[model samples]
Target: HMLAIGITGSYASGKTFILDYLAEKGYKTFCADRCIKELYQDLSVQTQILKLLPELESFNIGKISNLIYNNDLAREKLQNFIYPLLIDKLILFKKENANSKFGFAEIPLLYEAKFDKYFDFVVTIYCSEEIRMQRAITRTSFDIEIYNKIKEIQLSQESKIAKADFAINSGVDMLDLEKQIEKLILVIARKL
Candidate 1:
């Protein structure tokens, strides 16, 4: 049986890094963030987004982010419109990768979006708030207000860890993180 593994974490918690590592090891990986970006590039999706949030003169990411973060209604409207589409993409990804030994998906909002039930196992990456804050600041799109808003909406790190089937501390350096993943892959392989 193919094990569907869901990976989630707070913002900037290295979910993508872990997914990339798994992909490097020849496992199939899906990223919800990447999928969303691709969706944004489609003309139909762009038209829908503009219709939903009329404040935007265009569908570019920067304007969208500013509109959503500054306005609660806009954020909710966008999420409502995009959530079903994201779920559909996830389902399609699972069907397409059914033959793989393991299919990993990086879904940052897994629990918040009630997506945990779709996975056989869930791995939550835990990183200290201080570390995460630093990393967020390093991003080109970083905004203090937006950062706080995003963090405010997410489940706390402790809660995620408690609910996860497996938890990885991403506070450590890359070498240590890689070692942990290597060990985890072996354990998951044996169990599956």
Candidate 2:
């Protein structure tokens, strides 16, 4: 049986980096955001989203994000519609990787989506809000306003750390971050 491990964190907290590292090490990995991105291309998903929020100009991510972030009802409706699909993808990932020793899933909204229970262990990637903001602006298209809005939507970093079985501080250098992950891998191995 594979040990399903959840990796969660606030925006720009290095969840992707951790998952990529684990994948390079040969662990099966799933990313909820990536799955959702693919889902957006499906005609059925596009039709459902339009039905829920007809005001949206089109099926593109930017339009959907703009609408959802500004409107609580729209956000809630989209979340209600999208989360179950994400859960199904996660389940499929688990079944496909059943023989792998460990399976890692990067779920940015693990707590908000109540996805923690599905994992054998959860890791929270933590970083200072200031650093996260800087990274968000530099690495992505997010501006300060969008960064703050996104932060407000997710559970706080501290809360996620408190709830996780392990917490990785990703605010430091890459080498240091790798060391932390290496230590965590050893600890998880012993637990299994």
Candidate 3:
């Protein structure tokens, strides 16, 4: 378990459930978006936003998710704006947790953020677009456009799967995914 692993996937790819499953196994999982949401809650990031998108005040802490949902371009805009800071925070977190045997970070937009080089192993979770869209419907308003927009910004399923050190197929049951993850983790731990 002495590996810093990055788990990523396309939108609605069951990354959260996978993280929870790993946590259930006593593994630590840090979500990069959860860290950014912390920045959103922190006044510093809010102040930075004020300097950039002054019109964004209408959105509260959690409201930005809605903005990204409404505006197709807003997700990329926000990603570009906070990427450096996000990477900085990620590095710091990893450094602070260096003594730990296992450090698993969940970040769906791994390729988008140019962070494939930051971990001992990069794992991509895969699910069909049909399944992804179905999941998105339950998570948000029945809006496929917003779902598609978010998905469009990510690396394609094939590309992610091809480049990933390991891929978790989310089409199967959770237990099956966990079994694959455990095997992958062991292989990586042995190598690194």
Candidate 4:
């Protein structure tokens, strides 16, 4: 049986680095964002988004993001449309990889979605709020209002650290973060 692990982080907290490292080490992994990216191309998903917010110029992530940025209710409605499909896709990936020795899921919104119980282990990748906010704004050019809304929905960093089985600091040197992953790998091996 494979150990199901959930990895989460605040925006720009370096969850991708952790997931990519695990994948490079031959671990079975799923990234929720990748799933969403793929689903964005699905006509049904785009059609639903168009139906929900008819004012979008075209059914694309930029349009959806703009809708989310401009209206609070849009976020909830989009979540309602997308999350169930994402959950199903993630669950399907798990079943498909059931025989693997371990599996990891990188889910940015795992906590907000109340999905902790779905994992055998949970990790919260940590970074300072300043760094997180700065990285996010610089990389994505998203409105700070998006960050504000994210804060409203998700648990605080302190709370997430308190709840996680593991916490990894992602604001450090790559080698330092690699060392953390080394120790975590040993611990997870022991857990298995």
Assess the local accuracy of residue 48 in candidate 3 as a C-alpha lDDT between 0 and 100: 73
Q: Which portions of model 3 show Cα errors greater than 4 Å?
A: 59-63, 66-77, 110-113, 140-142
User: Which prediction has more favorable lDDT, 1 or 4?
Assistant: 1
Residue lDDT tens for model 3, 33-103? 78877778777778777666555775375567676666656665776778788778877777777777767
In model 4, state the lDDT of residue 166. Answer: 96
What digit string (tens of lDDT, one per residue) describes model 2 on residues 1-192? Answer: 889888999888999899999889887889888898998999999999998899995788988878877887888888888888888888898889887888888875523556757689999999998888778878848677767678788988877888799999999999999999999899999997
Task: Give all candidates' CA lDDT scores.
Answer: 0.85, 0.84, 0.75, 0.81
Clashes of 2: 0
lDDT of 1 at 48: 90
> What TM-score does candidate 4 reach?
0.88
- lDDT of candidate 3 at residue 50, scale 0 to 100: 62
TM-score of each: 0.91, 0.94, 0.84, 0.88
TM-score pick, better of 2 and 4? 2
Give the lDDT of residue 137 in candidate 3: 81
The CA root-mean-square deviation of candidate 3, after full C-alpha superposition on the true structure, stands at: 2.6
Superposed on all Cα atoms, model 2 deviates from the true structure by an RMSD in Å of: 1.5
